[PDB]
């Protein structure tokens, strides 16, 4: 509204209050901000639940999930018969891209998800574009021919690498399974069941 001259006022004081609040020294912190936030965890003393929270974070990251979707899946599995500690494991592992990553035609789970979303993926009684469909223990997932028309091929090799709960024949692009992954195939990255109780408190 005139010659405000921040030099005139800032130096006018050299400390003051307005001077120090604005103090151009104001850095960027433009890397400090991001990373620390990123994601944290640890366990504390007063609530115990700290363990549950950290474990929940790990599990969701292992499959790339948003907390809201997780609450939905827990609600689904919760009601049925009884001690369903065998059901929700199948539910969490029934993800189509999860099956695609354990099937072995992608270098990483999220990359497999990208593929799925880009329409690589052919099913049985149906087809698939959405990377969240719950598959049934005994289901087939015939891979497209167009993807093979783009030989990067490097994948087929991973396919054979596989994990026992997945039965897929390389090159020939086909997959199904039975005897759903036992806890051995769900390694100690997240192997606890009081995260279930954490969601029982938070989700009715």
């Amino acid at each position: 509204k005139y010659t405000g001259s921040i030099f005139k006022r800032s130096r006018r004081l050299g400390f003051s209050l307005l001077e120090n609040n604005k103090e151009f020294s104001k850095g960027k912190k433009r890397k400090t901000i991001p990373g620390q936030h990123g994601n944290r965890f640890r366990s504390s003393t007063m609530s115990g639940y700290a363990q549950q929270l950290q474990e929940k974070q790990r599990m969701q990251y292992m499959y790339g999930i948003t907390d809201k979707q997780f609450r939905r899946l827990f609600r689904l599995v919760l009601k049925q018969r009884g001690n369903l500690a065998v059901n929700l494991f199948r539910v969490l592992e029934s993800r189509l891209d999860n099956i695609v990553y354990r099937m072995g035609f992608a270098p990483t789970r999220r990359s497999a998800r990208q593929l799925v979303n880009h329409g690589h993926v052919l099913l049985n009684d149906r087809t698939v574009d959405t990377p969240s469909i719950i598959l049934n223990p005994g289901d087939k997932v015939r891979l497209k021919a167009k993807t093979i028309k783009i030989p990067i091929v490097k994948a087929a090799s991973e396919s054979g690498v596989v994990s026992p709960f997945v039965e897929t024949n390389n090159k020939t692009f086909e997959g199904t399974y039975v005897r759903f992954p036992e806890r051995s195939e769900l390694p100690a990255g997240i192997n606890e069941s009081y995260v279930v109780e954490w969601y029982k408190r938070l989700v009715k």
């Binding site: 509204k1 006022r9 130096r11 006018r12 004081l13 050299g14 400390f15 003051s16 209050l17 307005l18």
Partner: protein
């Protein structure tokens, strides 16, 4: 304008309530009083500032 030069704090507009609660818009003006300070080789330059800022300068040793 009728405003301080150190800060940007200006007038305060409000209501003039009287008996019978009659409403009339009024303006409170800040006490702009001239003041001289020593900055950049102590160069004194008269600056119209609010008495509040005048007290702040006096306590901050700036006003000398």
């Amino acid at each position: 304008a009728k405003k301080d030069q150190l800060t940007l704090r200006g007038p305060l507009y409000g209501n003039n309530r009287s008996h019978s609660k009659t409403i009339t818009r009024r303006k409170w003006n800040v006490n702009l009083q001239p003041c001289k300070v020593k900055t950049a080789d102590g160069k004194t330059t008269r600056i119209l500032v609010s008495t509040r800022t005048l007290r702040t300068l006096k306590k901050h040793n700036r006003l000398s």
